[PDB]
Copies of this chain bind each other. A is one copy, B any other.
Amino acid sequence: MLSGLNHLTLAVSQLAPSVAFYQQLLGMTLHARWDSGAYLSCGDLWLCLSLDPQRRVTPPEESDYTHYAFSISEADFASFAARLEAAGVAVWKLNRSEGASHYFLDPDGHKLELHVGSLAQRLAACREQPYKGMVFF
């Protein structure tokens, strides 16, 4: 049986700027760095940054909707989002926000998100505002 994401690995084109983004700007904990990668944690998440000569800096209109959302409390959400905006972090556009969410890009164009709320909370909210054709199991 599968239980949990073991780790998320992001391919990066330039290791140092990516480490700086996740550690300095997003506040994740850096545990180790080497010539071709780094290991960070964000709560229980194990994040690997892997230096990959294949990774391209990708504009958001050129990538699909695959994305990675990080949890933040309702009390911290707005000021963290505003800090990213003031720092000039690039954003990506959607037709609709997933509740209380802020959408932004990493240095290589990985699609990231800050979101307030759990899956249970989202399911409860969606019961009142369902997607088209939504069924709940």
**Contact A46/B119 with A9-B67, A131-B34 known, Cβ cut-off 8 Å:** yes
Closest to A99 in B: B6
Whether B1 lies near A72 (C-beta < 8 A) is yes
Tell me the bound Cα distance from A110 to B40 in angstroms. 22
Contact B32–A123 (Cβ < 8 Å): yes
Contact B134 A4 (CB under 8 A): no
Copies in the complex: 2
Please indicate the chain B residues that have their CB under 8 angstroms from the CB of A33 in the complex. Answer: 133-135, 137
Q: Residue-by-residue, is A16-32 near B (CB-CB < 8 Å gives 1, otherwise 0)?
A: 00000000001110111
Cβ–Cβ contact A3 & B72, under 8 A: yes
Q: Determine whether the beta carbon of B66 is less than 8 Å from that of A9.
A: yes
Q: Do the beta carbons of A5 and B6 come within 8 Å of each other? A: no
Q: Known contacts being A52-B65, A66-B10, A66-B11, is A4 close to B45, with CB within 8 Å? A: yes
